[PDB]
Amino acid sequence: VNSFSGYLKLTDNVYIKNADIVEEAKKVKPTVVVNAANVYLKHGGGVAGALNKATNNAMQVESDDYIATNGPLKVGGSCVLSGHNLAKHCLHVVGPNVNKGEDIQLLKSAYENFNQHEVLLAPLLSAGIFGADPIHSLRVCVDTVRTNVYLAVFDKNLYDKLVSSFL
Numbered sequence: 439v440n441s442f443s444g445y446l447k448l449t450d451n452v453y454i455k456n457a458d459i460v461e462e463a464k465k466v467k468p469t470v471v472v473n474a475a476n477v478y479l480k481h482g483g484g485v486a487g488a489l490n491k492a493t494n495n496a497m498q499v500e501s502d503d504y505i506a507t508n509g510p511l512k513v514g515g516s517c518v519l520s521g522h523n524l525a526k527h528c529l530h531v532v533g534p535n536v537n538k539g540e541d542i543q544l545l546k547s548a549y550e551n552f553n554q555h556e557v558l559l560a561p562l563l564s565a566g567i568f569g570a571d572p573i574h575s576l577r578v579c580v581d582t583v584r585t586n587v588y589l590a591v592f593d594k595n596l597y598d599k600l601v602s603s604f605l
């Protein structure tokens with residue numbers, strides 16, 4: 439039993455809700471919140487910009503030190519950093535950005551990072567400003583993640599379409 443509330447159960451391990459991931463994290467304080475990161479950990483917009491804003495830019499400060507030490511992530515890769523006031527940890531995961539021409543096949547690799555954590559609060563990878571089809575992202579999530587994932591979909595209209603079209 440966990441404290442995630444109001445989710446629709448899609449499969450044995452995948453759950454979904456129309457919610458703002460920032461407000462969900464602040465309520466649940468999960469062990470792991472997933473950020474829709476880029477390889478430079480520049481949290482300017484989308485989910486990343488919203489999470490970073492909620493940390494009063496502490497996420498960005500920590501991220502800049504991470505990059506200065508380690509260099510950029512790989513597309514499809516991840517790193518674990520602090521969750522600041524939102525969660526114990528933040529798993530920064532880089533899905534491909536279609537608006538940069540990046541290979542969509544890397545979306546499966548991106549979701550594989552979730553399997554290193556027993557329970558996660560997450561967005562749909564490569565959705566929103568990353569330019570991929572959120573329906574496809576949900577399919578890859580369900581077919582790749584084996585640990586317990588709670589998906590927050592900000593747009594109410596998109597959520598209803600994801601639910602209604604889910605096979």
Ligand SMILES: CCC(CC)(CO)Nc1ncnc2[nH]ccc12
Pocket residue numbers: 457458459460484485488561562564565566567572590591592593
């Ligand atoms: C902008 C698209 C979407 C769904 C509304 C997923 O790709 N992005 C988010 N999904 C969950 N929580 C969010 N908070 C701020 C943005 C955001």
